[PDB]
């Protein structure tokens, strides 16, 4: 009773994306009216992002597309546009209509749970059947950022709408926590890598936290954000000092502590772990946040999303001293937009790329 | 009796320029048949340098080409390639043709002094005539950083052959000094920078130094590379961090000091200068970078001045307390190749832009 997917990706990804601030998120409410404007808002805007997201994927080489997981990845993406479909002609004042629509964003969730190492499968799919080509592996790092940061957009909407309308703490909004204590997320992830570090090498660096706070140097640094976020991207980069402080300094048993400072300007809220692991040489940077070579999609991923609020995550080392890592987030709810790709020409001719001599000099 | 200009252009634009490494300039010696040699291969290699750059220039903007600024370079870049044109058909064994030459490299870099503020003059006149807009813009941000970075390669070549075939540090190698101390050279530019902000503001913040030389403790760091280059970057450097810390600290009689390490890995030097003078939010780095907003080329020249030689540098910054800056230099001398743009269908394609909808959703 449904038409053909095809009919309706066409359809939907001429739209673009609708990206909300923060402070939209925050400012939805809970009532049955704001549940029927939930509704009819995300019947329309979940269909547009996974359609553009789908249509990008067309754009794979073949080689990529081919591989049986990201084929998988695909008809998953197809099956939740059509859960989607049959609520089209629904009635947003039949209660009815709410509780299934509810019950199948639960499903959609949990039918792409597994999307990351999926599609991470299908990038080795490609690499074990064909070997792997610089043009390909282009394509498919500027791809997966976008559609990455696409998923994370669309989880968001997901659980924004499933735990507002269906609790630890009632006075986050869905999963926002309007007064998010960035040093406490900072010591959440920190035990919890802690715990980690401890368990392979029986040991770990002490934890340092300074706080400056600009314009109130009294007050403890609070923001609006999604602490799950958060504490993703502290989580990794903890595991990644702990590691470089523990192995190159397996002489030692006093360790140097991962210093971290949390920066409230009037713009930035910015977050710095610096370690003394003995760093890693410039050249090799690029590669942290490479998709291919890291075929622990941790790194890239924590940046996604960092740059999804309009933030960033960014790594400086010193080789022989160590490295240090900062996440830059808005601090204005104001300034925090979805940063969202859409499906245009734009888009369209990125991809459009070959093999060629570049426009610097080899020797 | 020479024939007109785009003849030799054409001819000589299609090889590509020919990177040279430290170590080669370095084992470059002086005498006679050295010279001879260094003239064979820079009435070619100059003429491939010269002519590769003239043809990205006629790729500029309609309006930014029609300015008088660009139009004046232009034409010192056509008489810089038609003088060396003059020595084609000259005998090397003949040591009147030696000197002739090295008086014409004298002359072409004297004419060339001041092509970085004249080509800023060009920027300008585009702005005030046409008005600006971004793809343009987009255009003289890639062709400056590769204009600049041409223009100090062919800098580097002349200097070279002058210092060498015609002496305060007799044991440097034309410019290069086989055994740079990194710290003195940080100590030069501190000092320089100190007299200009104690003329200013009558204070100035101090210096501390740390090396951290992993392979070697205790040995002072040093390394084979162009000292004047060094000292341009980190002046630069200096002039900033010494200005945000005096003006962010108004109202104190206590500066915070300005913080220097300088690391020696197994591949990469890296200084980092980190002062505490307030920061600046992250939206605006780039800007710092950018000829446009520029239009003060202090920073865009020195990150060019580190890629060079396969370096680069860096800001990172964190608003409301300050700023890191990172030198990243090879430390090898084998691995201190020249980065060289090159004129071909890549770097043409990239000029090939217009305006549209960018691949990122706007509000
Ligand atoms: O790249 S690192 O500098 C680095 C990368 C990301 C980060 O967030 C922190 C880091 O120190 N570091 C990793 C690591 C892991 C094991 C090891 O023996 C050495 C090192 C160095
Ligand atoms: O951008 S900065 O962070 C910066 C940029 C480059 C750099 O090398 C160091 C810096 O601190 N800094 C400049 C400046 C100059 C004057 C002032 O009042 C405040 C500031 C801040």
């Known amino acids: 009773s449904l038409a053909g997917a095809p009919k309706y990706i066409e359809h939907f990804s001429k ?61 998953w993406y197809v099956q939740s546009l059509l859960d989607i479909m049959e609520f089209l002609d629904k009635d947003p004042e039949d209660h009815r209509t709410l509780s299934q629509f ?9 039918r792409h749970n597994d999307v990351v190492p999926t599609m991470a499968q299908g990038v080795l799919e490609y690499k074990d059947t064909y070997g792997d080509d610089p043009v390909s592996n282009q394509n498919i790092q500027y791809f997966l950022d976008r559609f990455y940061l696409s998923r994370i957009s669309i989880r968001m909407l997901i659980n924004q709408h499933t735990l507002i309308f269906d609790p630890a703490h009632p006075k986050h909004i869905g999963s926002i926590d309007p007064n998010c204590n960035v040093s406490e997320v900072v010591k959440d992830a920190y035990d919890m890598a802690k715990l980690l570090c401890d368990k392979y090498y029986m040991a770990s660096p002490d934890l340092e936290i300074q706080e400056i706070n600009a314009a109130n140097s009294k007050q403890p640094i609070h923001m609006v954000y999604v602490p799950s976020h958060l504490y993703h991207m502290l989580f990794e980069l903890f595991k990644n000092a702990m590691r470089a402080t523990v192995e190159s300094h397996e002489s030692s048993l006093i360790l140097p502590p991962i210093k971290v400072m949390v920066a409230l300007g009037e713009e930035d809220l910015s977050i710095k772990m610096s370690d003394r692991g003995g760093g890693v040489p410039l050249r090799k940077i690029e590669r942290l946040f490479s998709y291919m070579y890291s075929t622990g999609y941790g790194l890239p991923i924590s940046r996604l999303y960092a740059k999804y609020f309009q933030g960033d995550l960014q790594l400086f080392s010193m080789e022989g ?35 060629e001599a570049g426009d610097w000099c080899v020797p």
């Open 321 to 355: 001293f160590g490295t240090d890592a900062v996440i830059y987030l808005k601090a204005l709810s104001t300034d925090s937009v979805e940063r969202l790709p859409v499906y245009n020409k734009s888009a369209w001719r990125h991809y459009q790329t070959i093999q």
């Open 15 to 75: 739209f673009s994306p609708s990206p909300l601030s923060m402070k939209q998120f925050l400012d939805f409410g809970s009532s049955n009216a704001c549940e029927k404007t939930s509704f009819t808002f995300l019947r329309q805007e979940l269909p547009v992002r996974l359609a553009n997201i789908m249509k990008e994927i067309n754009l794979l080489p073949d080689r990529v597309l081919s591989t049986p997981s990201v084929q998988l990845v695909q008809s």
């Open 102 to 110: 509810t019950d199948a964003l639960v499903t959609i969730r949990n």
